[PDB]
């Protein structure tokens, strides 16, 4: 506990702007970087990252260079923030640390950036908790940091990374998820690399800003819609980029956060369409739904009429007739003529029960037919068809399990004995 209270007690020492914090706070932090508790190491990493947004602080960091590679990707990105200045970029170059990282970014970690950022956002505003307002910041990405010192331009163009992402953005597939995924990754990479005065020069030649504008207002996937607004707000961090955007009717904020009351006579990334509903155009799609006996009920009643066997029965769609081909079952037997009319009566009644306008009366009718002739309910052809109707009607639950249980205790000698015969 004293570990943790003392160590997180340094935010006040940072956020209150104490005299010459760089002299001793950073050395104490680096000493605590080695301690036993992983949680305390993580929070120390967090506070050090919060501190390193001051250039003098970062320089006084680069007076002593420790090894962060024994920690997680958090320390990885923390060390990647070193690339902001050639004074230190030269130190880092000596063992080829650049090409050993950059390729692995291009191949694997660029896709991880979008995953981790959407992770942070979902934790922020979706109540996910992967096992009051938060503050979501963009993690430090290599491609953004290289472009800072005007020579990473060469160090990047040696591979011609621009061409693959750009012809990706001109001709996207937009069918399934990995195209979407790497397309988002490319978008975020572009937004990052557009974040300097110099990078603007190396991106303006392809004239892809019109491509992103086209995507932001005529594309399909709404997640890509949101990502377009995000990246376009990103490329609005510099004055020259804001000048570029204003040509295409997109407003942006032209002041920094240093004073919360700025007068309009380096900024925060932000871009909006001038008339917000412009991006709200969606093309609609047409809906996909584009594609005898009961008349006898008047005069012909139960009492006087009682003194294939089905209308909608075929060689298919019977629980016994289907097996007859595949297993060579015996043909269905013909027993006692007086029943068929009853069969169609009960099926008409249950079809009437489908309306459920007066369920109880039809329920009583089938119940009467039931106990009057309790043994009639052994036919399989009727059973398969009522199963089919339950697969093709809309029934309230009570009538549904009622009609199911009305065939609860039945025997079916014919299938079972024929099957044990044909088994062996």
């Amino acid at each position: 506990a004293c570990r943790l209270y003392a160590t997180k007690h340094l935010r006040v020492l940072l956020r209150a702007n104490v005299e010459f914090f760089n002299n001793w706070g950073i050395e104490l932090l680096v000493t605590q970087l080695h301690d036993k508790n992983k949680t305390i190491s993580s929070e120390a990493l967090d506070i050090l990252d919060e501190a390193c947004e001051d250039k003098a602080n970062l320089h006084a960091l680069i007076q002593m260079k420790p090894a962060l590679s024994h920690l997680g990707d958090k320390g990885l990105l923390l060390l990647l923030r070193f690339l902001s200045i050639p004074k230190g970029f030269s130190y880092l170059n000596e063992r080829g640390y650049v090409a050993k990282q950059l390729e692995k970014w291009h191949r694997e970690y660029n896709s991880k950036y979008v995953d981790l950022i959407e992770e942070q956002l979902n934790e922020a505003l979706t109540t996910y908790r992967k096992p009051q307002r938060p503050h979501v910041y963009l993690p430090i990405h290599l491609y953004g940091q290289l472009v800072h010192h005007k020579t990473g331009c060469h160090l990047l163009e040696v591979q011609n990374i621009i061409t693959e992402l750009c012809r990706n953005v001109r001709t996207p597939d937009l069918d399934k998820w990995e195209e979407i995924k790497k397309l988002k990754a490319s978008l975020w990479a572009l937004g990052n690399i557009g974040s300097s005065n110099w990078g603007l020069n190396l991106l303006q030649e392809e004239n892809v800003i019109p491509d992103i504008l086209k995507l932001a207002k005529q594309c399909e996937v709404l997640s890509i819609r949101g990502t377009c607004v995000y990246v376009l707000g990103l490329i609005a961090k510099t004055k020259q980029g804001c000048d570029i955007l204003k040509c295409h009717n997109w407003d942006a904020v032209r002041h920094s956060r240093k004073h919360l009351w700025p007068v309009v006579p380096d900024y925060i990334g932000l871009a909006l369409p001038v008339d917000i509903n412009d991006i709200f155009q969606v093309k609609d799609i047409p809906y996909f739904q584009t594609k005898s006996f009961h008349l006898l009920r008047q005069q012909m009643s139960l009492t006087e009429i009682m003194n294939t066997g089905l209308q909608e029965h075929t060689d298919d769609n019977c629980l016994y007739c289907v097996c007859i081909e595949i297993l060579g079952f015996q043909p269905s037997n013909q027993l006692s003529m007086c029943r068929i009319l009853l069969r169609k009566e009960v099926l008409r009644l249950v079809i009437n029960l489908s309306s459920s306008v007066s369920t109880k009366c039809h329920e009583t009718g089938l119940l009467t037919i039931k106990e009057k002739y309790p043994q009639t309910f052994d036919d399989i052809c009727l059973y398969s068809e009522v199963s089919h109707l339950l697969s093709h009607c809309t029934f309230r639950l009570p009538c549904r399990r009622f009609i199911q249980e009305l065939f609860q205790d039945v025997q079916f000698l014919q299938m079972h004995e024929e099957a044990e015969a044909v088994l062996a």
């Binding site: 956020r15 503050h135 979501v136 709404l222 819609r225 707000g233 925060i268 297993l327 079972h416 062996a424």
Partner: protein, 456 residues
Amino acid sequence: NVPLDLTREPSDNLREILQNVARLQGVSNMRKLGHLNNFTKLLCDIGHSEEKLGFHYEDIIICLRLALLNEAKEVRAAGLRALRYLIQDSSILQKVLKLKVDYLIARCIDIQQSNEVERTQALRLVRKMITVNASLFPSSVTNSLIAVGNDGLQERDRMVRACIAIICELALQNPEVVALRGGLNTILKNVIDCQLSRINEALITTILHLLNHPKTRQYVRADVELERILAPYTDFHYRHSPDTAEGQLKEDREARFLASKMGIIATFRSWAGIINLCKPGNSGIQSLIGVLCIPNMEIRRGLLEVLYDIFRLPLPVVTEEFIEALLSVDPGRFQDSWRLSDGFVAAEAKTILPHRARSRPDLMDNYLALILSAFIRNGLLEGLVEVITNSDDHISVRATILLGELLHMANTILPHSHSHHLHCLPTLMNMAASFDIPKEKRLRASAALNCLKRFH
């Protein structure tokens, strides 16, 4: 109950299954439970392939399905235990389903006769089959599940939530059958009757995802499905269920309002919700704002909560006097965690002193700016001023506080062109100086302006 495990698998299983069918006679049911358990063991330990199995799969499945006719429920449970172990490749399942075993599983699903160890097996069998192949899912099981998921809540069945879990899981692979049997409306109605947070948001995410892919977009209608969730506010008399107990009515209304509010704040998070709900046509978001200017005493105190926790603002305590409510939401308000024992300094120092970043983006403000502009487009301030003017004080204070907070956000995260004319406050100011209107509106608008200044 005969463990050998060292013999000819063909003869072993053949005599096992023959004695299991037993001509349906002369064999006890508990020893049938035995035979089934031994059967399951034999498939567990023996590699399953016809050549060394010595049999086709058709005779095997036909023999298994006869176990579903006897009276013993646990026999059906063991039959399910076996059947899940049979499904191994799509060919196997399609040969199984061409046989009308679907209707049998269907009977087994809907019995609810105090037998809660069987249908669980049936449901997990269904999950196995949908994982291996949902593209060949049967319709009968679909209809059974939709039936239990539609009106299972009134009969207090304890498997409805598991059921909607299943239908949502299957919805990803084959929306054709779900739509044809009309499931999406069932799901949607099921988002209003679940007060728990996480389940509600997870459910709504399904249909929100369904609005992305053009294939998916073809499956859903235009203006009847999603904007349904905002029903209990757009209606003055919403009746969600036909057969309800008279003994409680209002508590129904509070439950419905909580569910609908949480659903609303859920849908405004995803891009699909935002784009769909603000179409240039007569979309529902215009309807919400239009409702706001009707004098109904509780509706106007229903919407303000939604507005606050959309913008993730701190609610004020209900009060008839402005200045108390002002202090109630001061950011410098004390927090319980700031006591000695809890968070003595560091947590409090997190809140009070400002962040050290000077140029980092903070996308959260970007999202809030987008939503704010979306509301500004549809004349939200007009309705706000309407409520501030013509209503009760309990509600006037709430609306005034919201207006002040939104304006303070405006000149802080909003680009100049969209923020250079809003702060002029045309409509309120115009009413403030009319000398022909009844004086009540005039003086209360004046006081409202005074409160706004002190707020700033």
